[PDB]
Design a protein around this nucleic acid. Sequence first.
DNA 1: GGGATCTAAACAATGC
DNA 2: GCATTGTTTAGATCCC
Length: 159
Amino acid sequence: VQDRVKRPMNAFIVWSRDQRRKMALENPRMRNSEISKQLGYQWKMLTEAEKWPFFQEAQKLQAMHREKYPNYKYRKGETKKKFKDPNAPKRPPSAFFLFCSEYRPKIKGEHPGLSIGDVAKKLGEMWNNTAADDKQPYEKKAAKLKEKYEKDIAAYRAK
DNA sequence: GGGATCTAAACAATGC
DNA sequence: GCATTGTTTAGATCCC
């Protein structure tokens, strides 16, 4: 495990590698902290047009990497929540699931021969049909709850 | 359980 | 190792 196979470098690292070297040239003091600090800054300040193809480098990396190694590979070096976390804070209900809940009684209405779990399948195809603007309110609702959820996970980190 | 998208802790590497 | 932020991973999310 110590000689763990290197995980596919995320797009940030790709950029960081060549950028850091250039930065060392341009910046006279080139302090590790200072170089990297603004380095990450510029990255997130970059345009998505730049991110996309950089992300593709990482995507191709992980694609070949994951298939290459059958068993030996990056395991989630997590921590307490490495296994099934008994008391993980409850995330905001997913927009899809919110829509599913709303249509659940309706689906059985369409066909009086569906198990409650099977009604989700109906939602699945309607999910694609659902207009982005129409589904947006649900997602926003979850996003608002997400802020609340972060407080919950913060409590998890420290009471 | 059930489809079908989602989340957060932790790690991923360069050049000093 | 640092700091930056991105991919990792594997449960997690609805009602009945």
